[PDB]
Amino acid sequence: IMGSSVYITVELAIAVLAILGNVLVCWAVWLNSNLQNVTNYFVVSLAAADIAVGVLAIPFAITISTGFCAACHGCLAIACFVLVLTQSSIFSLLAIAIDRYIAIRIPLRYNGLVTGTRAKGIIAICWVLSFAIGLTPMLGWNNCGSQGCGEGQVACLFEDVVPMNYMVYFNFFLCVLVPLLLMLGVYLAIFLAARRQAKQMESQPLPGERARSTLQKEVHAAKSLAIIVGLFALCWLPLHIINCFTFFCPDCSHAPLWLMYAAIVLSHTNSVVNPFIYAYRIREFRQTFRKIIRSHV
Amino acid sequence: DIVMTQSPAIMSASPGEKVTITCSASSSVTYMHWFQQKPGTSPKLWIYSTSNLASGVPARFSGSGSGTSYSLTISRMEAEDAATYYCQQRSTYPLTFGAGTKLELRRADAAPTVSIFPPSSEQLTSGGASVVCFLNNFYPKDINVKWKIDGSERQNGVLNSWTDQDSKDSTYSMSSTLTLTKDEYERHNSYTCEATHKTSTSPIVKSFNRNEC
Amino acid sequence: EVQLQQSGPELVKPGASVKISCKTSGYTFTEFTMHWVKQSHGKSLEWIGGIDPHNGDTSYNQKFKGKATLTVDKSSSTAYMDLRSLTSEDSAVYYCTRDYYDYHYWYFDVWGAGTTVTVSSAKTTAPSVYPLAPVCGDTTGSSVTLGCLVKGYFPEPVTLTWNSGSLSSGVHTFPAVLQSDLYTLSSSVTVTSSTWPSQSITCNVAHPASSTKVDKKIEPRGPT
Ligand SMILES: CCNC(=O)[C@H]1O[C@@H](n2cnc3c(N)nc(/N=N/c4ccccc4)nc32)[C@H](O)[C@@H]1O
Numbered sequence: 001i002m003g004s005s006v007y008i009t010v011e012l013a014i015a016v017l018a019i020l021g022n023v024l025v026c027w028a029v030w031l032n033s034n035l036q037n038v039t040n041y042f043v044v045s046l047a048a049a050d051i052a053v054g055v056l057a058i059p060f061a062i063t064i065s066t067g068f069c070a071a072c073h074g075c076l077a078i079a080c081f082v083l084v085l086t087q088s089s090i091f092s093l094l095a096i097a098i099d100r101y102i103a104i105r106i107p108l109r110y111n112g113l114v115t116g117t118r119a120k121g122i123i124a125i126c127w128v129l130s131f132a133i134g135l136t137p138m139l140g141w142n143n144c145g146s147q148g149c150g151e152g153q154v155a156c157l158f159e160d161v162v163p164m165n166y167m168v169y170f171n172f173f174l175c176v177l178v179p180l181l182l183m184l185g186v187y188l189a190i191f192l193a194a195r196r197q198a199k200q201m202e203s204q205p206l207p208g209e210r211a212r213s214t215l216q217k218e219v220h221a222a223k224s225l226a227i228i229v230g231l232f233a234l235c236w237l238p239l240h241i242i243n244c245f246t247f248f249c250p251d252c253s254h255a256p257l258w259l260m261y262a263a264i265v266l267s268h269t270n271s272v273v274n275p276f277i278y279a280y281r282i283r284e285f286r287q288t289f290r291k292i293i294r295s296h297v
Numbered sequence: 298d299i300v301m302t303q304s305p306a307i308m309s310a311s312p313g314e315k316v317t318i319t320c321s322a323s324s325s326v327t328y329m330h331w332f333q334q335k336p337g338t339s340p341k342l343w344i345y346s347t348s349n350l351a352s353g354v355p356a357r358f359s360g361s362g363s364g365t366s367y368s369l370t371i372s373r374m375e376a377e378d379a380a381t382y383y384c385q386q387r388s389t390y391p392l393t394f395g396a397g398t399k400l401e402l403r404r405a406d407a408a409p410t411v412s413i414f415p416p417s418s419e420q421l422t423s424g425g426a427s428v429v430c431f432l433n434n435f436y437p438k439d440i441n442v443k444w445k446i447d448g449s450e451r452q453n454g455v456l457n458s459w460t461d462q463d464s465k466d467s468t469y470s471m472s473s474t475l476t477l478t479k480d481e482y483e484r485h486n487s488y489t490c491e492a493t494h495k496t497s498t499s500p501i502v503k504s505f506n507r508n509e510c
Numbered sequence: 511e512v513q514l515q516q517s518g519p520e521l522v523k524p525g526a527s528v529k530i531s532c533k534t535s536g537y538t539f540t541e542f543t544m545h546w547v548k549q550s551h552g553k554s555l556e557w558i559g560g561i562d563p564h565n566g567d568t569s570y571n572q573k574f575k576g577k578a579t580l581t582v583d584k585s586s587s588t589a590y591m592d593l594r595s596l597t598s599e600d601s602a603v604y605y606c607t608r609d610y611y612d613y614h615y616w617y618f619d620v621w622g623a624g625t626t627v628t629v630s631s632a633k634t635t636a637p638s639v640y641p642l643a644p645v646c647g648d649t650t651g652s653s654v655t656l657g658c659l660v661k662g663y664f665p666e667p668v669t670l671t672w673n674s675g676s677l678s679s680g681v682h683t684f685p686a687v688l689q690s691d692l693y694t695l696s697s698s699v700t701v702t703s704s705t706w707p708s709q710s711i712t713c714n715v716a717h718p719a720s721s722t723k724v725d726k727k728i729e730p731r732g733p734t
Contacts, residue, residue, distance in 0.1 A: 155609055206562055206567055209541050340605070346614065383555055391557055394547075394649075412643040413643065414645070414657045417643070418731075421734075427640070429696055431657060433698060474685040510646040
């Protein structure tokens with residue numbers, strides 16, 4: 001009972017922290033007019049996705065940690081729900097990274113690429129892809145298509161209902177690997193651009209405000225994307241690596257339950273850590289946060 | 298720091314002639330700028346980043362160079378291009394310019410026109426006496442003036458002034474004024490100035506006698 | 511249309527100080543740094559320093575440190591240079607330039623008209639103008655040349671025109687020469703032999719320093 005109790009406590013604490021941080025970000029963007037733009041719109045969409053993860057995905061994952069005898073398809077649907085919510089969070093983060101890449105490396109077309117309803121279109125595409133990938137097991141690609149309980153009912157654990165081939169070849173590659181590679185490429189491009197600008201400017205004392213602004217924006221974006229990529233990888237890679245070596249290592253010792261709990265809580269900590277750290281990197285966000293806190297008190 | 302040495306310091310070129318002027322750097326430089334300045338006017342950007350023509354610069358101008366040596370060239374010389382050109386460096390501070398290259402327009406030779414002027418009555422009333430000799434519209438620059446008083450040369454108290462190359466004639470003019478006191482001017486009769494030039498086998502002589510006026 | 515409007519001429523005595531202005535227009539003033547260049551005796555371009563109008567950062571040439579101080583008026587979109595403890599060496603022409611950023615390198619894009627600063631304690635004196643009629647003699651064929659002498663004035667410049675600018679071509683005004691704190695300038699105008707003395711040719715000399723306007727009509731010489 002001790003392990004289950006501590007796991008549930010950690011999961012609920014993560015959910016509450018994600019809820020608080022993301023509602024704070026949304027409140028700050030709603031209040032300040034100087035915070036209302038496309039990048040903050042993507043940040044708010046990611047924050048809402050993380051709110052959904054904390055309210056729904058985390059309690060649902062706790063529900064699949066029980067193992068009580070229940071219908072196979074209901075628990076398959078719950079697992080697909082948590083999958084869809086995590087997909088939405090990851091795709092919103094990728095959208096923010098793409099917005100930063102367009103802003104930094106494509107300044108002239110930026111107003112013509114992401115402004116207007118195109119941001120809503122991109123968010124809708126992210127959610128559609130999330131639902132499509134997360135609801136593929138419901139099309140018959142599942143184990144129930146095996147006698148923990150019997151006659152349709154099973155012990156509701158994630159691996160009992162969700163096949164591993166989908167989790168490795170499909171979920172790990174398209175959802176956790178491809179966005180990670182894209183974010184790494186964007187970070188590398190912005191880092192190289194920033195260091196090229198710095199090397200160009202270092203020869204001259206007293207540079208123009210134009211060059212100073214360019215270097216400032218490039219460095220800030222590069223460090224923000226470094227933080228984003230590092231946190232995303234640290235949170236998501238362990239669990240999917242565990243899945244990969246469960247699928248590829250036959251009869252090898254299945255990961256001890258504490259390791260599985262740690263991987264799950266890290267994957268959920270992704271949703272609370274992003275994009276609050278990114279928001280705190282901007283002076284306006286933290287100024288608004290402090291003003292709201294002072295007004296409340 | 299760094300030193301910019303330009304060559305040639307002074308140059309003349311016929312219209313249509315290809316002209317290349319160089320700019321030597323004491324140490325290696327990454328970029329070289331070029332500024333064209335005409336007399337009486339501020340310098341204007343001509344070539345930036347060692348190859349790029351500024352706005353309004355004709356395509357006949359080209360820029361080149363790297364490291365120590367840099368240069369700009371004119372495909373065919375035009376009369377509008379007679380000016381002074383400076384090369385600027387901004388690799389190692391402080392910024393250093395070049396001494397500049399005065400570019401002149403080569404012309405057909407022309408004999409000077411010499412006129413002499415006795416001192417006016419107003420200057421005589423003031424105790425002064427200046428005789429002015431004007432040498433105008435000649436090419437090339439080299440010229441000499443000799444003052445003779447009563448058959449003997451006088452090198453005392455002469456003032457020589459030279460104009461720059463004329464905007465239209467592209468010629469040169471020289472003013473030579475010999476200043477004396479009224480008593481010594483009234484102490485002599487004959488005054489003359491002679492102009493020796495390559496365009497005449499004998500010097501051009503203009504003279505007057507004070508006994509007339 | 512990017513323009514840099516500089517101050518007017520400044521005649522000052524040794525030990526004094528001057529503040530040259532540079533009024534910018536046609537571009538976002540704070541986006542590009544302003545630099546000042548001194549040209550002394552002609553054909554000697556020296557970089558004084560630069561100032562960033564956005565944050566006030568400055569980088570000076572160590573030669574001119576303490577001599578020139580660069581300030582900026584962001585509201586008025588103007589740049590100033592203060593030249594303190596002036597001597598005769600500081601007498602030169604000073605320019606202000608805009609240091610444009612091409613996203614690849616830097617260059618002086620637009621140059622100001624320039625300001626002439628002359629420093630000397632020499633006494634300001636009005637010119638003495640003597641008209642130079644041609645030698646009595648006779649008209650030597652094609653054309654006749656007339657002269658006008660400006661003796662003993664200070665300081666430069668002095669504007670000389672013939673018939674108040676009606677005669678432009680055929681005029682040779684020569685650079686002035688100093689003889690113990692006094693300039694001397696002469697001008698020659700050549701016209702057709704049928705014009706003079708039939709028409710009136712006068713010499714218009716103006717000295718803004720002493721605020722004197724004098725016109726000397728050139729007439730045939732009488733007995734001496
Ligand atoms: C964008 C991709 N989304 C996700 O990876 C999200 O789905 C969940 N998840 C994914 N793969 C999983 C796996 N192999 N095992 C488990 N639980 N095992 C248990 C064993 C014993 C007692 C309790 C539990 N959970 C998994 C998790 O919530 C993660 O954030």
